[PDB]
Design an enzyme around this catalytic site. Structure first.
Site, PDB file in Angstrom:
ATOM      1  N   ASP A   1       5.785   2.667  -1.528  1.00  0.00           N
ATOM      2  CA  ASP A   1       5.057   2.687  -1.057  1.00  0.00           C
ATOM      3  C   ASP A   1       3.219   2.144  -1.281  1.00  0.00           C
ATOM      4  O   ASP A   1       2.216   2.190  -0.429  1.00  0.00           O
ATOM      5  CB  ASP A   1       5.373   4.496  -0.299  1.00  0.00           C
ATOM      6  CG  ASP A   1       5.980   4.921   0.807  1.00  0.00           C
ATOM      7  OD1 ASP A   1       6.258   4.232   1.254  1.00  0.00           O
ATOM      8  OD2 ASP A   1       6.858   5.568   0.573  1.00  0.00           O
ATOM      9  N   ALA A   2       3.583   1.934  -2.298  1.00  0.00           N
ATOM     10  CA  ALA A   2       2.236   1.388  -3.440  1.00  0.00           C
ATOM     11  C   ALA A   2       1.397   0.174  -3.456  1.00  0.00           C
ATOM     12  O   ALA A   2       0.757  -0.189  -3.805  1.00  0.00           O
ATOM     13  CB  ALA A   2       2.403   1.378  -4.722  1.00  0.00           C
TER      14      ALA A   2
END
Lengths: 285, 298
Positions: B242-243
């Site tokens: 998710d980064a």
């Protein structure tokens, strides 16, 4: 959460005891209200209401509920109806060459999001046949002779009639409708117009927007009435544009707005959420 | 009458071939003087110019669209002639040809909304690319893909042993010589080698306004927090979950009136709009990544 409901939709002159009278009737009959919406227009002295009620626990079928509710409706001179959530409305879609709105609606229907029956698609060209026939929906090519429009008009109105249409949807259909069609389907002909009305009526609204140099453009879902582009607005939205955006790019952003706005307006219609009064809508979301 | 003449004029000049020169490099006084002089000296007409300095890292970013036929060389010759300037200024750079279609591999699981949106834009000539194939962990979306004459590869994931599935995705992506891999709501773990080999070429659509609501069921998470807006995030996939670099985001308003199923439904529209916009920016060479962030030249 996936339960059958009846929807009771009412517009009538405002009276002090209507909420009391309708709530007494519903409660006394075990009407489990899942949703209730109200609006008073004090300036015209009108009241608007919509109730979704669980069907299974109400001791009426659709016809019996209509009969039982008639004395209240007559007492309050109501414009009203009751519909059955499990009774799919018959939608006729009309399209010309632009496919974006049609494909959007067909996808929503195909994926079981849009709760309705697509009875057929009518078009003045053959371009969109293949995409429509993939869905096993009848597709009808009714070309328009611009010198003699009566045969086109008659065939459109016959096809709409044959399919017992509940709604006619103009998914960027660019030709003139049969003049009788909006009279017989009053507030049942939904259009998507490609500008943020009342700005930029007529031809090439994105071109008109570009020339005026607006910083936002939009689309308008509205019911079609006898007067061009003047009909009751169901939904509008906008997208931001800048000097950087050429006409081609504005038209492209516009397609996304047209698609979204038509979908929202048609679903509100399908769910018995839209009421027309004084050429305006109450939309109970 | 003035709105129709404007209709013809706008069609008249459309669709001319351009080269796109995209540069990131340490910010220096004479970068633009040197590049623009190079272009001017080869008679290149610049039809779009977008520059940006990031004063905190001291980096410079630029994108020029140049009419391909105003220059005296092809793409290969442009690259060879420009290499000295690139080396002088330690540039991370590339030149693309607007007439060379990028090859896009699309991945999807059971949900059809993002995939159908992209396939429709492709079929209607809005999305300028070749869709090499669709890879899926299920057979659900086969019919809609095969109607477009695009190959469909069913690569089921064995959740006990994931290596046979991983190897086949990588083989298929390699065989189709992908320039971009797009996760159109594909919900399985990617081969860990894929986002390293295709660095900043794997684009995902996530169903929350990041960084809120990571993990399982982001719409359910939003409903419980009682937020009044939800959204979707298009981002490049990196090794950390998710980064990755955010390309685009948008939101839609929700309220107490909306059930989780309503919010999920609104979600699908935000997701597909955001993914399309992000993919298009990428396909047009408008997205540069620096410090885990993006510059998007619109």
């Amino acid at each position: 959460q996936g339960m059958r409901t009846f929807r009771l939709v009412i517009a009538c002159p405002d009276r002090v005891g209507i909420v009391a009278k309708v709530s007494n009737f519903l409660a006394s009959h075990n009407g489990w209200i899942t949703e209730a919406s109200h609006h008073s227009d004090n300036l015209s002295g009108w009241f608007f209401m919509r109730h979704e009620i669980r069907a299974d626990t109400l001791p009426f079928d659709l016809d019996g509920f209509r009969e039982a509710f008639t004395p209240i409706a007559e007492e309050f001179s109501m414009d009203w109806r009751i519909t059955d959530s499990a009774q799919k409305k018959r939608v006729v879609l009309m399209a010309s060459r632009e496919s974006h709105c049609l494909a959007d609606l067909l996808h929503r229907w195909h994926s079981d999001e849009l709760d309705c029956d697509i009875a057929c698609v009518i078009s003045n060209h053959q371009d969109l046949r293949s995409m429509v026939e993939w869905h096993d929906i009848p597709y009808y090519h009714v070309p328009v002779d611009p010198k003699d429009k009566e045969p086109a008009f008659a065939e459109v109105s016959r096809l709409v009639g044959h399919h017992q249409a509940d709604v006619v949807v103009l998914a960027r259909y660019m030709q003139i409708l049969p003049p009788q069609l909006c009279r017989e389907y009053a507030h049942q002909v939904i259009n998507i117009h490609h500008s943020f009305l009342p700005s930029f009526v007529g031809a090439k609204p994105y071109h008109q927007a570009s020339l005026r140099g607006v910083k936002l453009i939009g689309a308008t879902c509205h019911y079609v009435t006898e007067e061009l582009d003047a009909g009751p607005i169901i939904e509008q939205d906008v997208v931001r544009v800048s000097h950087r955006d050429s006409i081609e790019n504005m038209v492209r952003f516009g397609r996304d707005v047209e698609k979204m706005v038509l979908a929202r307006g048609l679903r509100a219609h399908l769910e018995d959420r839209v009421l027309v009064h004084d050429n305006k809508t109450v939309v109970f979301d």
